[PDB]
Every structure is written in C-alpha cells, then in structure tokens.
Amino acid sequence: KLANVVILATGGTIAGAGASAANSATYQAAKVGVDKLIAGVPELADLANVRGEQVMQIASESITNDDLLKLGKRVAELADSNDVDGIVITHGTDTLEETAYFLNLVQKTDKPIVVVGSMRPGTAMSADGMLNLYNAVAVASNKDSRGKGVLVTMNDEIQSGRDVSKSINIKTEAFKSAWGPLGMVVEGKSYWFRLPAKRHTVNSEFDIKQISSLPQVDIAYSYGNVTDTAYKALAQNGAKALIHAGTGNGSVSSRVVPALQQLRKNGTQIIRSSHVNQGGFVLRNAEQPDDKNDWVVAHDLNPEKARILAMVAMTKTQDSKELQRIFWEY
Amino acid sequence: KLANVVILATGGTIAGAGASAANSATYQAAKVGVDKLIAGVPELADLANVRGEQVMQIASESITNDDLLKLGKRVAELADSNDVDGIVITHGTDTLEETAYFLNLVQKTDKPIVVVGSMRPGTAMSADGMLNLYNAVAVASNKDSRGKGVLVTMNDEIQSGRDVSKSINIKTEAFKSAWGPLGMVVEGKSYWFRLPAKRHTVNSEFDIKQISSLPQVDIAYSYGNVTDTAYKALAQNGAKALIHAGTGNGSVSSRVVPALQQLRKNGTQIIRSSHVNQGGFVLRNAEQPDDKNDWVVAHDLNPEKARILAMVAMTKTQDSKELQRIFWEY
Amino acid sequence: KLANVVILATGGTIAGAGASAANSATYQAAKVGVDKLIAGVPELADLANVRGEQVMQIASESITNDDLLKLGKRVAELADSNDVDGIVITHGTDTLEETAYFLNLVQKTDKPIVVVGSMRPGTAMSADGMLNLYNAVAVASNKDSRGKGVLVTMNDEIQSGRDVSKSINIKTEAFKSAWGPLGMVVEGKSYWFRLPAKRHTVNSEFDIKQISSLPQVDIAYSYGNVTDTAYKALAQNGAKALIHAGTGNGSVSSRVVPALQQLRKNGTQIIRSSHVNQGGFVLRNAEQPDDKNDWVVAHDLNPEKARILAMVAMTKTQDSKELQRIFWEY
Amino acid sequence: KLANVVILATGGTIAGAGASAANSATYQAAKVGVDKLIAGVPELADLANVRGEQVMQIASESITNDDLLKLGKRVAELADSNDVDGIVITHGTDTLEETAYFLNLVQKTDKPIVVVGSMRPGTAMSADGMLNLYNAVAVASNKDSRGKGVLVTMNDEIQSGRDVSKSINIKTEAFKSAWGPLGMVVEGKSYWFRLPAKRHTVNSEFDIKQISSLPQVDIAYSYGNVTDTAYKALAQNGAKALIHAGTGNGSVSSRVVPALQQLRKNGTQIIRSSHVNQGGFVLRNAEQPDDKNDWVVAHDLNPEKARILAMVAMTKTQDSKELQRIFWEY
Ligand SMILES: *[C@](*)(C=O)CC[C@H](N)C(=O)O
Ligand SMILES: *[C@](*)(C=O)CC[C@H](N)C(=O)O
Ligand SMILES: *[C@](*)(C=O)CC[C@H](N)C(=O)O
Ligand SMILES: *[C@](*)(C=O)CC[C@H](N)C(=O)O
C-alpha cells in the first residue's frame, strides 16, 4: 500500500512569505506551519500517507549546534519506528547543505531521509516549493531510495546530501555538486544514474544516539594580506579545530603558518579546506607539509562541510591520522 | 612592426618546479626566472618584441597590500611609455583573481593588461604554462584587446579580470566566471564573443598614481553556529571594513547582527558578500535591512573580490551610499 | 509613464495544459490564448501598459519557414509604430532558439524584443511561466534593454537571442549559452554584466522587409559509420545549403568528403557545424581544407543556429567567402 | 609485481602531428606509432609493465562498424588472458564516446578498460596527451578500477564510458557527462566519488564473442521546417533503426509523424533522442504517444550514444518493449 512518510518542518523559505506575488527574493522566512504547508499540496495524498510535525520554526542561517542534535535525535526516533517508512525534512536553503551532510553521517538507517527547501517563498508567482515537497515525498516513499544515504530533492534532481551545496544565488538551480546529481525525479518517478561511493548512514562509524554535544569547530577565511588574527581569536574562544578556508589547494600564507603550527602544538586540529569549491580537491602534502606539521586535509569538502565532518569525527577521535582517514572515507 | 610587450614576472606555478615529470600538483612555486620562461617559448618572437622583468618571486597566497601597490605602480609606468603596447603579468593562480581585479580598477589605460598563470609546473608532463604564456602575449599584442579592461588568458579562453575566479582545484580549467568568458585565443588568434558591461581601467574613477596606501579590509566567514568572535577580533585589529562571507544571499545569523550593528556605529564598513560563488548575486534589503543598518551589499562579487573593491573604494569615500554605488558599477 | 508593451503569442508550453497539477512534463501545448495568459499575471499592469495579440497557436517543433516570416513581419510593423515601446513573444521552447536568432538578424530596430517560454505548463504546480512572462514584460519596458539585440528571459536570466540554446531537458534552467547570460532580472529590476559583441538588429545588413521567402536549408548529422545518404537526399530535395553537424571540430568522414565536394560543385553551400555544442568553436581549415574545397565554417553556432544564419545570409549572397565573413560577424 | 597493461592504439590526436609547436588545433591525426607514444612517457614503467599494440591508424570520424568489431574482439582476447590486468585504448576524440560505450556494453569482463585521447597533438606546446596516457595506465593498473565498467581518463578525471561526451571543442576539458565524473586521477593516484548505476560489462546481457555483425542504424536531425526526406532516405538505404535527434524532449514535427508511423509498420525501429544533450532525458509518452505508435525513447542518451545501444540491442531483439527496457537499464 502507501508508504508512511513523516515531514519534519524546520522553517526556511519554503515556509516563508513575501509582500506580494512579485516578491520572489525578498521575504520573511519561517512564517508558515507544517500543516498549512502540507495542505498546499493535495496531490501529496496519492503518493503516501503523510504526517506533519513542526520540529522548529527558524531561518536556517541562525541554526545552532543544539538545533542540529534536536533534529538529528528526532530523526533517529522516527527511523526506529516501524510505522515510519520515509522521512522528509523542510529546511532553509542557507545551511541545508550542512544539515544534510550531518544527518548523512549520524543516522544509522537505510530508510530514506530527504531534505528539501525552496528558493522562492510560497507566496511568490512560480514558487518552486510545492513541486519540491511533492518530489520529496515521492522520493521518500520509494523503496529504491533506501541505502542511498541522505538525499536532497530540488530542481527536479536527486542530489547526495554529502556534497550538494548552495552554489548559485536567487535561481532555483541553486544546489550543485562537483560530482553531479544521483538521478532525477519527474512526475513522481525516480530515475537513478549514479551511486554514492563514500561511507554513509548504515555503514557510518558514527551514531547520533551516542552524541550528547558537538565539539566547537570554526572556520577562518584566507585571502591576500591575510593575518593570523582570526585563527588565534577563534581558538582562544574555545575552537577544538579550525577549518582553514585557503586559496587554491588549501594554501597557507607564509605569515599564517607559524600561528597554525603553534595552534596545532596546543591541541587544536588544523584542517585545510579552500574557497575553490566548484571542483577538484585539496591534496595532502601538496601545498603544505601536512605530515611534518601534523595537519589534516579536507579533500573535496568545502569549509562548511569540512566543519560538520570535523565536529562528528572528533566525538570519536582526537587522532590526526585517523581524522585524515575519516576525511578520505566520508 | 611587431608590437612591444613587457612580461612582468611575479612567481607562481608557471615559474614553479616539481621533483619529476609526473608531478603536476606537488611542487615548489617561484623557482624559475623571467628570461628562462621566455626562453622556453621561442615562438614568442613570432608574435612580438618581448622584454622580461622580474618584479618579485613569490607564491601568490603570501602576497601583501604593498606587493599590490608595487606591481600596480610598475604597470602604470610601463603603460605611459610609448615603447610599450601590451603588458603580460605571470602570477600565481591562488590570488590571481584578486590582483587582476585590482589592476582592472586602478590602471587608467586602454593598453592590454593580461594576467596569466598555470595549474601545472613547467617541469611536469603536459604542463599548461607554455601555451598560456603564448596566448597571453598573443592577446597583449592584439589591437582588438584594447579598451576591454584587464584580461586573464588560461584554458584557451579570454576571461575578464573582474569576475574570473579560481573555482576548480587541480584541473587546467581552474578559472571560471559566472558571466562566461569574453572570448577565446586559438593559434595566436583572438576571438571575441562578449564585451564588459562594468566600469574598468580608462573609465574608472580610481587611479594608482593617486593611491599611496590601501586601508586594511578583512573577511569573516559565516556558517552554522557562527559567533561574532572573528568579526570583532578583525575589527579590533585594524579592519576598516569587514567582508561578511555569508550563507545564501549574504544572510547574517541573528546572533551576529547586533555585533555588526555596533561595529558599524564605530565606523567599520559592513559589506555583505557570500560563499555562494557560482552564480546569482546578493540583493540589497532582501536578507537584511541594509538601509536601516547602513550596510553595503557586494552584488555578485565573491568575498576576496569584494575585499579588493572595498579597499580601493575606501581611498576615495567612507560614505556607505557611495560605496554601494561603486559596488553596483564596478 | 508606463511603457507600451505588446505581447505576440505563438503557442507553446507556456500556453499549454496538463491532466493535473502533478503533470509538469506531460501536457498539451498551445491550449491557452494570449488574453487568458495575460490575465494570469495581474501584476503585469504595474510594469507597463500591455496588449495581447495571438499571432498563431502552435507547438514550436512544428513551426514552418512561413510561420517565421509571418512573425518576423508582424514584429517589424509593431516596431515601426510609435505607440509600441517593447515587444514580448511567447514561444514554445523547442525552437525558441531558432526564432530568437532569426529575429536578432532581421529586425532592424533598437526597441526591446524579448522571446519567452516555459518548461512546465501553467496547470502544473510550481509552473515557471508566470514569472517568466513577468520578467519578459519587465525587461521589454526597460530603456536599458534597448540596443542589446533580441533577448530571452527565463530562469531569472537575460540571455542573448544569438547563442542561447535549449541545452537541458525537463528542468527550468533549460536554456544555456556557451558565453554566459548578459545579466539577470530579479523583482522587476534588470542587472547587466555583459554586452554582445556580434552584429545584430540595428547594425545588421539584413532586413525582414526585403525578405519574401527563405532559401531551403537542411541539416545532416554525422557519427560513426555515417554515409552520404542523408547529404545527397536533402540536396536532391531542393536544399540550397547543407549544415554538416559533424563530430568534434566540424569533422567530415573520409567516405562523406567526396559527396560534399560534388555537392559544392553543383551549387550547394557546405557549412561545417558540429554536435559539440557546450563550448568552443569550429576552426576554418583545421579539420578540413575549407579553402581548397570552398567550404564554410559555422564558427560557434550549433546546427540549428547555423541553418538560420545560412537562410538569411543567402537572401543576400551566394558567395562562400562572404558567407564565411557573415558567420564570423553574426 | 607490477600489473601488465596493454595499450591498444587506434590513431587519433594523441598520435597526431602539427606543423609547429604553436599548432594545437590544426594538425594531422594518426601519424605516430604505438611504441613512439610509449617512448615519450618513460615514467610509464614506474606504473606497470606495458605492451604496445597497433590495431589501426585512423581518424575516429572515419570509423566503421567493422572497426568496432575488430577492436571489440581484440579487447575480448586480451581480457581472457591472465597475462593482461588492464587495457588502455588510445582513440581519436571525435567518436571516442561511441566506442567507449560500445565496449561498455559488449565486453564481459571486470578488468579495467580505459579509453583515452587528447585535444592537442603531441607536437604542440602544452600537449595534453602525455599526462592523459600516464593517467590511463595509472587507472588501468589500479585494482580499484575493476568492476566499474569502461572508463575514459582525460582532464585529470575518471569519466564513465557510458555517458561521457565530447561537449566542448578545442579545450582540454572537451569531455563532459551530465551525471558528473566518477572520480579523478592525480599523480598516479585514483580518487573515487561516484559509482555507476547502469548495467555494464560483467552484468551486461550482451557479449562481443556472440556478435558477428551489427545492424545498420542511422540518425536524422530535427529542427524548424524539417521534412521526412532524410528519414525516408536513410530507411530506403538499409537503416534497421532510425535515431530521431529531436528538438526538446524528443519532439516530432506534425509533418514528420505520419512518415515515422509508416516506417514503423515497415519494421524500422523509431528511437526518440534529442539534441538537448547537457542534461535531463527524453520521457516516454510525453511529447508523443510512444505506446500507440510502438516507438522507443532513448532516455538520457544523446543521438550517437542511442545509435550504439540500438545496434547492440537489435542483435538480440526487435521487440520494441524489450528495446525500451534496454534503454532504461544500460
Ligand atoms: C529564502 C531562500 O530559501 C530564505 C532563505 C533563508 N536565508 C533561510 O531560511 O535559509
Ligand atoms: C600552482 C598553481 O598555480 C602553484 C600555486 C601557488 N600556490 C601560487 O603561487 O599561487
Ligand atoms: C513544453 C515545454 O515547453 C512544451 C514544449 C513543446 N515541444 C513546444 O511547444 O515547444
Ligand atoms: C584531435 C582531437 O582529438 C584530432 C581529432 C580527430 N578528428 C580524430 O581522430 O578524432
């Protein structure tokens, strides 16, 4: 029969509202509740038996680590339930990529977990939210969606929660991945073209049930004439690990290297990422002697993704060699 | 009757060196001299009369504001000479997009200024440097190249120095612009398909000859659970303007808003940019009341690009409304 | 005051209708008339004084050369009128790129000509048509839109009618150009980032007023084991010129070259294009001796674009050297 | 204990030759031998024990169905030998995507089969061939490469032979897949990010050892004002199946429909593909009643790719429903 799908609403633009129908970029996020959001798509009933639950009502750029745990643990409870077949989470696009990757690492279930949002508020003309939610439920109730990890369904695509990222502003095609979408969803039907190769959900060594609180991890941006100011201030404020958002291949300025070395000697993990996020990856020992300095490379993960993985990995290990191995498998 | 082109060497991967021919990503930059580079491309003579000049031998990620002024002034001197028709600058790829944009804003000349680099060291197999240098001189010696602002010539393309960006790591197609290439360079021939719409070089209200010092501008990255720590730290250490690299449409977490407001009252310019750099732009008054807070929006410019424009702009005005106009015109 | 905008409706998906709101890819095109299409966007009134006119009601893949002339001449009449400031044409996406390029070459006016369509029918949920039409009128009533040539406004972008093409199926971001969009349209405001470099509208040597009928031009596809069968059959059926949709750089199979040579000797113009349409261009004399055989290269234009330019150019010249010059300027 | 890799040379640009070092696009293909190619990359020895074999010396645009069978059978023989671990095939870029897909369908083996080419002749500056060949052997000698189907290694990427396509002319980044790269190859090391979802090699129901002849399949291009001329001509000359390269979602002009129906009754398979090859796919029963007319839809495969699948499929069945299943699984 129909699959049982639960919709966990967290707010965002999909639940936002603007001044008029012409307002597709200027609006107030997290204004509409889950039940009114479900009622806007009557054709949802033909896809599955759907239930709405309001986990929170926020603008995603203002999300906290405790908001993540709250959502993560609620997902884990729903997943354990026999009466729940799939899970759809409505999330603001700003940090959707962070939450999607977090869930991918800590939810040890093969049940479909789909995160969805929209680039235009439901009050705008040609609002992308209705179809995105339809596609979300369509994918969550599909048996073929199992064992694929966390999924993001926007712009008629099925993107991997791991490496999808908000790469384009304003437009509905906002979410892209350097390794392409896994498939597409058209008229309730899912079409797969690729499979993930990185560890996730059921085969992850991490488990949200064991996590009580996440370690503080912060990101410093690198550019011309950059100093160590931001790096030291974040570390002094409690950061257990710093994500270096370097130029090119995770490059570090000669006048910032000393700060990073002493920060490492003082127990802070130094993870090299970059602001070159359309493609490619940061190679270990290429731009900097990571072995010599005992640093970690973030591979292909962008700064915000790298932070998420760092937080999670550190609840299990403070070993840099193991942290490096984790950045190469997840 | 061959044009006179001067090559201004600054280091980078083009003048880099790896341990073997199989080393295309692991190597040491700034190892080769200017006339050694010129000697490797004998065919350069066919295109024009080339003169080499070593301005500096550095890795671009370690560039400083003074290095920018030195290069900017050396370029201005060459531009005023009648014995110079076009100017080529070999520069490390890491911060090439920053320098190229700086020159696009402060060089009051219609003579071609082409910045070029390479993703592979000249010691590697299939090194991309030689052809890149050849195309650079080909474009600099071409009369059709005048009046189009600063250009970057890599991957057989003619990119605008304004918005071209290092978006992909490792690959030779590293540089991309959200608005596309202006043209292409094939077998010494230039092909134009697009023209710049933004103010540059000749019609720029800025001039390197009147610029003696650049104000300190820093960048703070925004993400999930971000605090005002780095923002305040950077401001306390001399930052006259802070480039906010926000999530989505330059969004600011509710927790960082009051700090940004206080730093604004204290005279630090708040420029909202984003880490969504593949397309679109940050819209004024959308995600935040820029009018109420007297903040500036970076339009389509990424963080590092917005930093350069801010620096240059602030040498002429500290009026936020004038600053916004400038970000909308350059 | 408000600009006078005329909407010329030709049918297509924007005027289509599906079985239910879930039907975004399966529908019946050309079902809704222009007046009902205008009435679906009440906010259109705030943008300009709009008038609707039904030129035809067809599915664009079934468009004829006489349908093009009909539309082309009707545009020319509206453009000559002082009571018309801008023109918007609703057209099916399938051959939108053909019509947009045709108008770009034959309408000698600086008035804004905007072609628009949608990827989903107005009956679907999250239909992209309403906003596309709004953006179309917004752009057509903008004084800054003048002298830019023919424009296509879809997916919040402003694309050039010359090289925009339907490159992706199903998705709203269907239209792409190898040289990028000219700008974007967000909330009725137009933002420009690039300018066209190719000849168009007011500076075109072609004029629809002089054209009574277009020459027959056809396209043959090239692949592995291709024979001359299609090339000879099309020519024998009246084709004055054949567009060779070759592999790679307009390459021609060794067993197809003879047919092309004799076809040329018999008065048929041979234009080399390719099915490598994401980027780059076909170089003259590279893959085949175009000078020796007196062939023409289509530069960067795809097969269907190349056909449009061929048809138009031939109403003025049957000279191959001049045809080549035209393919290098338009 | 170095793996044994055989390089099967077939010609192309890698073995091409230009007049000078400045000639990167104008040159003559198939000029260099297999052991001359191997001698140019001495470092190849570090990776594995390599044996060279010249199967043919042709320009890929002039490839025939028999050339495919010859290569396909020579590959099968090498695959069954225990003295062969991986197979590298140097092939002209023009029809590389066709051959690579053919081999992906008919080679019943999990041993690595890597097809490689280059955009610049080895005589040119910054020729891309040497590194491309190095990566090819690096990937073929890697145990991780087994069971992933045919791979193409250019531009530092690991592309799937199924959907990789020559999408950009001139540039080294010529090959692109709508579903993204599977991984990357850097400094002799392979990095995987995605796995194939479609049937290939080992789990393919096809086998080159049981294939003696390939049925003739041709392609007709669709556009504005298209007639049934080429469709009928191709069918009258032996075409057992016609690949319709339609506009949009494989749409067919109302004028060409009756002819396609008559050719179907006569036994010619009608496969609807499109010239919208950057993304998306052709949907069954959307633009045309495929069920009523007993036609087949090519899914996401471009024209030349659909031709190869049709050829191979038709050696096993002429049942249209079975043919549709095959297009949905491979
Ligand atoms: C509109 C786009 O989704 C609202 C975005 C907002 N910053 C959010 O909640 O992420
Ligand atoms: C090679 C990439 O171009 C070396 C880059 C280096 N970090 C630089 O000088 O920017
Ligand atoms: C829907 C997409 O626009 C209908 C497309 C149809 N083939 C047309 O009229 O172009
Ligand atoms: C260079 C591009 O690879 C030569 C291509 C030639 N037409 C071929 O052999 O395919």
PDB file of C-alpha atoms in Angstrom, chain D residues 168-329:
ATOM      1  CA  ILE D 168      33.354  21.302 -25.822  1.00  0.00           C
ATOM      2  CA  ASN D 169      35.519  21.944 -28.850  1.00  0.00           C
ATOM      3  CA  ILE D 170      39.179  22.931 -28.740  1.00  0.00           C
ATOM      4  CA  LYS D 171      39.588  22.953 -24.942  1.00  0.00           C
ATOM      5  CA  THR D 172      41.237  20.114 -22.975  1.00  0.00           C
ATOM      6  CA  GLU D 173      38.079  19.833 -20.855  1.00  0.00           C
ATOM      7  CA  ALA D 174      36.276  18.581 -24.013  1.00  0.00           C
ATOM      8  CA  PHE D 175      34.660  15.553 -22.370  1.00  0.00           C
ATOM      9  CA  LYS D 176      31.699  16.014 -20.055  1.00  0.00           C
ATOM     10  CA  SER D 177      28.933  13.829 -18.604  1.00  0.00           C
ATOM     11  CA  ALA D 178      25.557  15.175 -17.458  1.00  0.00           C
ATOM     12  CA  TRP D 179      25.832  12.979 -14.347  1.00  0.00           C
ATOM     13  CA  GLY D 180      29.349  14.092 -13.451  1.00  0.00           C
ATOM     14  CA  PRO D 181      32.780  12.382 -13.254  1.00  0.00           C
ATOM     15  CA  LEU D 182      33.102   9.140 -11.297  1.00  0.00           C
ATOM     16  CA  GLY D 183      36.406  10.315  -9.848  1.00  0.00           C
ATOM     17  CA  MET D 184      39.794  11.906 -10.538  1.00  0.00           C
ATOM     18  CA  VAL D 185      43.364  10.745 -11.170  1.00  0.00           C
ATOM     19  CA  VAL D 186      46.141  12.794  -9.583  1.00  0.00           C
ATOM     20  CA  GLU D 187      49.848  11.956  -9.539  1.00  0.00           C
ATOM     21  CA  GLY D 188      49.275   8.299 -10.329  1.00  0.00           C
ATOM     22  CA  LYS D 189      46.590   8.025  -7.643  1.00  0.00           C
ATOM     23  CA  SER D 190      42.891   7.313  -8.284  1.00  0.00           C
ATOM     24  CA  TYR D 191      40.146   9.032  -6.271  1.00  0.00           C
ATOM     25  CA  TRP D 192      36.571   7.729  -6.418  1.00  0.00           C
ATOM     26  CA  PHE D 193      33.481   9.790  -5.617  1.00  0.00           C
ATOM     27  CA  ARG D 194      30.726   8.028  -7.592  1.00  0.00           C
ATOM     28  CA  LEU D 195      29.741   4.549  -8.825  1.00  0.00           C
ATOM     29  CA  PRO D 196      27.805   3.556 -11.995  1.00  0.00           C
ATOM     30  CA  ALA D 197      24.124   2.800 -11.547  1.00  0.00           C
ATOM     31  CA  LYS D 198      23.616   1.354 -15.058  1.00  0.00           C
ATOM     32  CA  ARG D 199      24.296  -2.158 -16.413  1.00  0.00           C
ATOM     33  CA  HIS D 200      27.727  -2.651 -17.962  1.00  0.00           C
ATOM     34  CA  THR D 201      30.479  -5.131 -18.850  1.00  0.00           C
ATOM     35  CA  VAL D 202      30.078  -8.120 -16.490  1.00  0.00           C
ATOM     36  CA  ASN D 203      26.343  -7.778 -15.859  1.00  0.00           C
ATOM     37  CA  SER D 204      25.570  -6.935 -19.483  1.00  0.00           C
ATOM     38  CA  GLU D 205      23.308  -9.349 -21.367  1.00  0.00           C
ATOM     39  CA  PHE D 206      25.387  -8.697 -24.489  1.00  0.00           C
ATOM     40  CA  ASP D 207      28.697 -10.302 -25.453  1.00  0.00           C
ATOM     41  CA  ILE D 208      31.129  -9.449 -28.270  1.00  0.00           C
ATOM     42  CA  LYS D 209      32.060 -13.137 -28.684  1.00  0.00           C
ATOM     43  CA  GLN D 210      28.487 -13.898 -29.805  1.00  0.00           C
ATOM     44  CA  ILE D 211      28.252 -10.794 -32.007  1.00  0.00           C
ATOM     45  CA  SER D 212      29.238 -11.345 -35.636  1.00  0.00           C
ATOM     46  CA  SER D 213      27.564  -8.404 -37.373  1.00  0.00           C
ATOM     47  CA  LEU D 214      25.919  -5.139 -36.348  1.00  0.00           C
ATOM     48  CA  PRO D 215      22.647  -3.934 -37.875  1.00  0.00           C
ATOM     49  CA  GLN D 216      22.709  -0.608 -39.726  1.00  0.00           C
ATOM     50  CA  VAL D 217      21.360   2.240 -37.587  1.00  0.00           C
ATOM     51  CA  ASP D 218      21.215   5.844 -38.757  1.00  0.00           C
ATOM     52  CA  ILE D 219      20.483   9.282 -37.336  1.00  0.00           C
ATOM     53  CA  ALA D 220      18.196  12.028 -38.630  1.00  0.00           C
ATOM     54  CA  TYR D 221      18.361  15.544 -37.178  1.00  0.00           C
ATOM     55  CA  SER D 222      15.199  17.506 -36.345  1.00  0.00           C
ATOM     56  CA  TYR D 223      14.720  21.289 -36.494  1.00  0.00           C
ATOM     57  CA  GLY D 224      12.493  24.090 -37.743  1.00  0.00           C
ATOM     58  CA  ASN D 225      10.819  23.305 -41.069  1.00  0.00           C
ATOM     59  CA  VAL D 226      12.234  19.751 -41.120  1.00  0.00           C
ATOM     60  CA  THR D 227      10.746  17.304 -43.645  1.00  0.00           C
ATOM     61  CA  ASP D 228      10.691  13.496 -43.686  1.00  0.00           C
ATOM     62  CA  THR D 229      13.246  13.450 -46.506  1.00  0.00           C
ATOM     63  CA  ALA D 230      16.340  12.221 -44.649  1.00  0.00           C
ATOM     64  CA  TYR D 231      14.236   9.820 -42.548  1.00  0.00           C
ATOM     65  CA  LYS D 232      12.843   8.024 -45.595  1.00  0.00           C
ATOM     66  CA  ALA D 233      16.147   8.210 -47.500  1.00  0.00           C
ATOM     67  CA  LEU D 234      18.037   6.565 -44.622  1.00  0.00           C
ATOM     68  CA  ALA D 235      15.343   3.874 -44.250  1.00  0.00           C
ATOM     69  CA  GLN D 236      15.344   3.154 -48.005  1.00  0.00           C
ATOM     70  CA  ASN D 237      19.110   2.695 -47.822  1.00  0.00           C
ATOM     71  CA  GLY D 238      19.209  -0.034 -45.192  1.00  0.00           C
ATOM     72  CA  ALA D 239      18.532   1.581 -41.807  1.00  0.00           C
ATOM     73  CA  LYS D 240      17.013  -1.004 -39.440  1.00  0.00           C
ATOM     74  CA  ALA D 241      16.508   1.704 -36.836  1.00  0.00           C
ATOM     75  CA  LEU D 242      16.461   5.493 -37.016  1.00  0.00           C
ATOM     76  CA  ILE D 243      17.636   7.674 -34.159  1.00  0.00           C
ATOM     77  CA  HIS D 244      15.438  10.747 -34.181  1.00  0.00           C
ATOM     78  CA  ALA D 245      17.544  13.654 -32.824  1.00  0.00           C
ATOM     79  CA  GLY D 246      14.565  15.826 -31.983  1.00  0.00           C
ATOM     80  CA  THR D 247      14.119  19.276 -30.544  1.00  0.00           C
ATOM     81  CA  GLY D 248      13.317  19.423 -26.847  1.00  0.00           C
ATOM     82  CA  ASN D 249      12.011  16.249 -25.253  1.00  0.00           C
ATOM     83  CA  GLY D 250      12.441  14.213 -28.449  1.00  0.00           C
ATOM     84  CA  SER D 251       9.545  16.088 -30.086  1.00  0.00           C
ATOM     85  CA  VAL D 252       8.491  15.303 -33.659  1.00  0.00           C
ATOM     86  CA  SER D 253       7.048  17.832 -36.116  1.00  0.00           C
ATOM     87  CA  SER D 254       3.424  17.122 -37.115  1.00  0.00           C
ATOM     88  CA  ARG D 255       4.713  16.781 -40.694  1.00  0.00           C
ATOM     89  CA  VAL D 256       7.211  14.016 -39.920  1.00  0.00           C
ATOM     90  CA  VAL D 257       4.863  11.962 -37.706  1.00  0.00           C
ATOM     91  CA  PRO D 258       2.952  10.050 -40.456  1.00  0.00           C
ATOM     92  CA  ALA D 259       6.240   9.061 -42.123  1.00  0.00           C
ATOM     93  CA  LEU D 260       7.676   7.774 -38.863  1.00  0.00           C
ATOM     94  CA  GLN D 261       4.481   5.748 -38.380  1.00  0.00           C
ATOM     95  CA  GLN D 262       4.733   4.205 -41.859  1.00  0.00           C
ATOM     96  CA  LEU D 263       8.421   3.362 -41.374  1.00  0.00           C
ATOM     97  CA  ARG D 264       7.444   1.710 -38.075  1.00  0.00           C
ATOM     98  CA  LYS D 265       4.840  -0.520 -39.740  1.00  0.00           C
ATOM     99  CA  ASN D 266       7.547  -1.442 -42.253  1.00  0.00           C
ATOM    100  CA  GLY D 267       9.720  -2.647 -39.388  1.00  0.00           C
ATOM    101  CA  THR D 268      12.149   0.242 -38.827  1.00  0.00           C
ATOM    102  CA  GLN D 269      12.612   0.895 -35.107  1.00  0.00           C
ATOM    103  CA  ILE D 270      11.910   4.548 -34.183  1.00  0.00           C
ATOM    104  CA  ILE D 271      14.066   5.728 -31.260  1.00  0.00           C
ATOM    105  CA  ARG D 272      13.353   9.243 -29.973  1.00  0.00           C
ATOM    106  CA  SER D 273      16.506  11.028 -28.754  1.00  0.00           C
ATOM    107  CA  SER D 274      17.301  14.773 -28.859  1.00  0.00           C
ATOM    108  CA  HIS D 275      19.847  17.499 -29.499  1.00  0.00           C
ATOM    109  CA  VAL D 276      19.399  18.825 -25.947  1.00  0.00           C
ATOM    110  CA  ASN D 277      22.445  16.999 -24.572  1.00  0.00           C
ATOM    111  CA  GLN D 278      23.656  18.851 -21.452  1.00  0.00           C
ATOM    112  CA  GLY D 279      21.125  17.309 -19.046  1.00  0.00           C
ATOM    113  CA  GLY D 280      17.692  15.819 -18.440  1.00  0.00           C
ATOM    114  CA  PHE D 281      16.249  12.977 -20.526  1.00  0.00           C
ATOM    115  CA  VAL D 282      13.526  12.100 -23.056  1.00  0.00           C
ATOM    116  CA  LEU D 283      10.353  10.970 -21.277  1.00  0.00           C
ATOM    117  CA  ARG D 284       8.183   8.174 -22.709  1.00  0.00           C
ATOM    118  CA  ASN D 285       4.655   9.200 -23.798  1.00  0.00           C
ATOM    119  CA  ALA D 286       5.277  12.886 -23.045  1.00  0.00           C
ATOM    120  CA  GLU D 287       5.811  14.593 -26.390  1.00  0.00           C
ATOM    121  CA  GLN D 288       4.456  11.668 -28.437  1.00  0.00           C
ATOM    122  CA  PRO D 289       2.255   8.599 -27.812  1.00  0.00           C
ATOM    123  CA  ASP D 290       5.074   6.045 -27.873  1.00  0.00           C
ATOM    124  CA  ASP D 291       2.671   3.351 -26.708  1.00  0.00           C
ATOM    125  CA  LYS D 292       0.237   3.937 -29.562  1.00  0.00           C
ATOM    126  CA  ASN D 293       2.947   4.215 -32.228  1.00  0.00           C
ATOM    127  CA  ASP D 294       5.154   1.465 -30.737  1.00  0.00           C
ATOM    128  CA  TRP D 295       8.187   3.767 -30.598  1.00  0.00           C
ATOM    129  CA  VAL D 296      11.188   3.740 -28.239  1.00  0.00           C
ATOM    130  CA  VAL D 297      12.583   6.636 -26.151  1.00  0.00           C
ATOM    131  CA  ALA D 298      16.374   6.983 -25.752  1.00  0.00           C
ATOM    132  CA  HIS D 299      16.182   8.202 -22.112  1.00  0.00           C
ATOM    133  CA  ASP D 300      19.243  10.404 -21.418  1.00  0.00           C
ATOM    134  CA  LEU D 301      21.457   9.123 -24.229  1.00  0.00           C
ATOM    135  CA  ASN D 302      22.387  11.574 -26.982  1.00  0.00           C
ATOM    136  CA  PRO D 303      21.890  10.564 -30.673  1.00  0.00           C
ATOM    137  CA  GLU D 304      25.246   8.887 -31.261  1.00  0.00           C
ATOM    138  CA  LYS D 305      25.013   7.080 -27.884  1.00  0.00           C
ATOM    139  CA  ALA D 306      21.455   5.869 -28.644  1.00  0.00           C
ATOM    140  CA  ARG D 307      22.675   4.597 -32.007  1.00  0.00           C
ATOM    141  CA  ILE D 308      25.296   2.363 -30.365  1.00  0.00           C
ATOM    142  CA  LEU D 309      22.807   0.948 -27.837  1.00  0.00           C
ATOM    143  CA  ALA D 310      20.275   0.321 -30.625  1.00  0.00           C
ATOM    144  CA  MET D 311      22.810  -1.517 -32.779  1.00  0.00           C
ATOM    145  CA  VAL D 312      23.877  -3.795 -29.959  1.00  0.00           C
ATOM    146  CA  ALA D 313      20.344  -4.350 -28.641  1.00  0.00           C
ATOM    147  CA  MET D 314      18.955  -5.272 -32.038  1.00  0.00           C
ATOM    148  CA  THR D 315      21.336  -8.228 -32.307  1.00  0.00           C
ATOM    149  CA  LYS D 316      19.202  -9.819 -29.545  1.00  0.00           C
ATOM    150  CA  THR D 317      15.683  -8.491 -30.097  1.00  0.00           C
ATOM    151  CA  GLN D 318      13.433  -6.491 -32.435  1.00  0.00           C
ATOM    152  CA  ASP D 319      10.692  -6.313 -29.789  1.00  0.00           C
ATOM    153  CA  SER D 320      10.102  -2.615 -29.110  1.00  0.00           C
ATOM    154  CA  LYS D 321       9.132  -3.203 -25.488  1.00  0.00           C
ATOM    155  CA  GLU D 322      12.347  -5.158 -24.873  1.00  0.00           C
ATOM    156  CA  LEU D 323      14.216  -2.366 -26.662  1.00  0.00           C
ATOM    157  CA  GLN D 324      12.683   0.211 -24.290  1.00  0.00           C
ATOM    158  CA  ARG D 325      13.704  -1.872 -21.252  1.00  0.00           C
ATOM    159  CA  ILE D 326      17.274  -1.992 -22.535  1.00  0.00           C
ATOM    160  CA  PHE D 327      17.348   1.818 -22.983  1.00  0.00           C
ATOM    161  CA  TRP D 328      16.182   2.146 -19.406  1.00  0.00           C
ATOM    162  CA  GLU D 329      18.799  -0.237 -17.982  1.00  0.00           C
TER     163      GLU D 329
END
